[PDB]
C-alpha cells in the first residue's frame, strides 16, 4: 500500500552532568529497525529488526558518524533555543526532531515531513509543499528567517525526495514478507457491573498490525485508551462506555482496520 | 538511513 520511513530524534540537555544526551530511532511504517544512543558504552547504530542486519559494516559506520554529527548540531540548536526563550543556563531542555517520507504503491514521494518540538511544544515544521516553514511562535520565527535566507528547505526536500525514497525502497524490498503484512484485530466485548444500575461495556481489539485503527461506541461518555504495543510486532486497544443495566442492547462497537474485509459491528453477546 | 550534511544534518535551529 502506502509506506513510510521516519527517524525520531531526541536531544536532552543536562547542564553540569556533561553534554546533552542524543537518542535516535528509525521506523519503517510501524516497525522500528535501528537505534542510536550517545550514552551507550560503545555508541554505534544498532539493528532492531531482522531484515536490516543485511547491511554491511559500511552502512553502520557511516550512520554512526552521522548521528554523532547530528548530536553536535542539536547541541548548538539547544544553545540557540535557550537564548531565544531567554532561559536559565541551568534548566534541562528537550529538542525533538521527526523527519521522513511517505510513498504510495507507485513508490513515488507522496508526502515529506521535517518537524521540531522544543520542551514538548511545536517549534517549527516544513510545510507539505516542502518549500516553506510554519513557525509555531515568535521564537521559531528567528529560525524561520535563518533557513529562508540559507534556503534550507531545498536541502530538506532534496533528501526527502531522493535518499529517503531510495532507502525506503531498499528496506521494503528486504523486509518484504514482514513490512507489507496485515494482521487483522481479534475482537470481543466484555461487560462489567459498576452498580445495581449500570455496567461498563468495553470493546477490545488485539493482535493487529499496523497500529492504525478506529474504535467507537455508538463520544462524550466514551473512554478511549491509547493504542499499545504487544512486544510482538503487534498492537492492542480498547474503548469503554458506561451503560445502564438491562440496556446493553442499544450499544454498538464499531471497528475499522486495514487488515480486515469487514468493518466490524459488535454487540455484547 | 538518516540524512547527512546534504539533507540537513549540519543545519541547526
Amino acid at each position, epitope marked *: 500500500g502506502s509506506h513510510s520511513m521516519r527517524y525520531f530524534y531526541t536531544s536532552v540537555s543536562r547542564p553540569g552532568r556533561g553534554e546533552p544526551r542524543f537518542i535516535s530511532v528509525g521506523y519503517v511504517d510501524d516497525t522500528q529497525f535501528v537505534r542510536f544512543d550517545s550514552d551507550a558504552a560503545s555508541p554505534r547504530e544498532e539493528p532492531r529488526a531482522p531484515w536490516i542486519e543485511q547491511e554491511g559494516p*559500511e552502512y553502520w559506520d*557511516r550512520n554512526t*558518524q*552521522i548521528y*554523532k*554529527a547530528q548530536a*553536535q548540531t542539536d547541541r548548538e540548536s539547544l544553545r540557540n533555543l535557550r537564548g531565544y526563550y531567554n532561559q536559565s543556563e541551568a534548566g534541562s531542555h528537550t529538542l525533538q526532531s521527526m523527519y521522513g517520507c511517505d510513498v504510495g504503491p507507485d513508490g513515488r514521494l507522496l508526502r515529506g515531513h521535517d518537524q521540531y518540538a522544543y520542551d514538548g511544544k511545536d517549534y517549527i515544521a516544513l510545510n507539505e509543499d516542502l518549500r516553506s516553514w510554519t513557525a509555531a511562535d515568535t521564537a521559531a520565527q528567528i529560525t524561520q528567517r535563518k533557513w529562508e535566507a540559507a534556503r534550507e528547505a531545498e536541502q530538506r526536500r*532534496a533528501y526527502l525526495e*531522493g*535518499e529517503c525514497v*531510495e*532507502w525506503l525502497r*531498499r528496506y521494503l524490498e528486504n523486509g518484504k514478507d514482514k513490512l507489507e503484512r496485515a494482521d487483522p484485530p481479534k475482537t470481543h466485548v466484555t461487560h462489567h457491573p459498576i452498580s445495581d444500575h449500570e455496567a461498563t461495556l468495553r470493546c477490545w481489539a488485539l493482535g493487529f498490525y499496523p497500529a492504525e485503527i478506529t474504535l467507537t461506541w455508538q463520544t462524550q461518555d466514551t473512554e478511549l485508551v491509547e493504542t499499545r504495543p504487544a512486544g510482538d510486532r503487534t498492537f492492542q486497544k480498547w474503548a469503554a462506555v458506561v451503560v445502564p443495566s438491562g440496556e446493553e442492547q442499544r450499544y454498538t462497537c464499531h471497528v475499522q482496520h486495514e487488515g480486515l474485509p469487514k468493518p466490524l459491528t459488535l454487540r455484547w453477546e | *538511513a538518516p540524512r*547527512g*550534511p*546534504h539533507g540537513g*544534518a*549540519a*543545519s541547526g535551529l
Partner: T-cell receptor, first 113, second 112 residues
Framework: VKVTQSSRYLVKRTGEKVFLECVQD?????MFWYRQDPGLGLRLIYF???????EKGDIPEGYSVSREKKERFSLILESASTNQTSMYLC????????????FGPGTRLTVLE | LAKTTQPISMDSYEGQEVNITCSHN???????ITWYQQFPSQGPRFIIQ???TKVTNEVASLFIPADRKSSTLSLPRVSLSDTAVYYC?????????????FGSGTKLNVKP
C-alpha cells in the same frame, strides 16, 4: 575565496623539520592538507574539521599538523625524507558543505639528501 | 581506495564539446557526485555537483543516469585555456567522517 600558503618553493635537507602554513579567512570549519604526485592525483595527508581537531587522512605517516586557531592549518614534516618531495595543496570548506573545497595556490617542496 | 574511475587523459580540438564519463558502480545511496577543475600550476576548483537530477551552470553540465552507476561531465565547446585535470569524486563528508577522495582525474589536452 581566499586560501593562502606561506611558501611557494622550498628546498630542504633530509632530517630537517619543515613547516608549511595554510590560512583561510572564510571562517571555514574544515581545513585539509593533500599532496599531489605524478600519476597519483591528490592524496589526503591530514584534515581538521574544527579548531584543535585532527584526523589522519590516507597518508599521515611522517607528518604532523596544527589547528590551534580556526583560520590556520599548519603541516609539519617532522623529519623530512626525499619521498616527501611533492606538491602540497591546502584546502578549506564549510561544515555544511565539506565537499565544496577551496584550494590554496600550493607549495612545491623538494627534499634532498 | 578510489571509488571513481575515469580516463587518465583525453585529447580534444578547440571548438568541440567535451564529454568525460566517470564510473562509480559502488556509489552509495547517500553519496553526492562532485567535479573539480585543476588548471596548470593551480589548485583544483569546484565546478559542479549533483545527486540525480541533471545539473547545468556556466562551466559545465553534469549528466547522471538512472542507476547513478556513472556520470558525464559535459564541457561546452572548449577553448585552449580549458586544458586542465578534471576530477570526478563520489562521497560524503561531515566532521570526522570523510569518504571524499580525489583520485587521479582526467588530463584534458585541448589542441588548436
Amino acid at each position: 575565496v581566499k586560501v593562502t600558503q606561506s611558501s611557494r618553493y622550498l628546498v630542504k635537507r633530509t632530517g630537517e623539520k619543515v613547516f608549511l602554513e595554510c590560512v583561510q579567512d572564510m571562517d571555514h570549519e574544515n581545513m585539509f592538507w593533500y599532496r599531489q604526485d605524478p600519476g597519483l592525483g591528490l592524496r589526503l595527508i591530514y584534515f581538521s574539521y574544527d579548531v584543535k581537531m585532527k584526523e589522519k587522512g590516507d597518508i599521515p605517516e611522517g607528518y604532523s599538523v596544527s589547528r590551534e586557531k580556526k583560520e590556520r592549518f599548519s603541516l609539519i614534516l617532522e623529519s623530512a625524507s626525499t619521498n616527501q618531495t611533492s606538491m602540497y595543496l591546502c584546502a578549506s570548506s564549510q561544515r555544511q558543505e565539506g565537499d565544496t573545497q577551496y584550494f590554496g595556490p600550493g607549495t612545491r617542496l623538494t627534499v634532498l639528501e | 581506495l578510489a571509488k571513481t574511475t575515469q580516463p587518465i587523459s583525453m585529447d580534444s580540438y578547440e571548438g568541440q564539446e567535451v564529454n568525460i564519463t566517470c564510473s562509480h558502480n559502488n556509489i552509495a545511496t547517500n553519496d553526492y557526485i562532485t567535479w573539480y577543475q585543476q588548471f596548470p600550476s593551480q589548485g583544483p576548483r569546484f565546478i559542479i555537483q549533483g545527486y540525480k537530477t541533471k545539473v547545468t551552470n556556466e562551466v559545465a553540465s553534469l549528466f547522471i543516469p538512472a542507476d547513478r552507476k556513472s556520470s558525464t561531465l559535459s564541457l561546452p565547446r572548449v577553448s585552449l585555456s580549458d586544458t586542465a585535470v578534471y576530477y570526478c569524486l563520489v562521497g560524503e563528508i561531515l566532521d570526522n567522517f570523510n569518504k571524499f577522495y580525489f583520485g587521479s582525474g582526467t588530463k584534458l589536452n585541448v589542441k588548436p
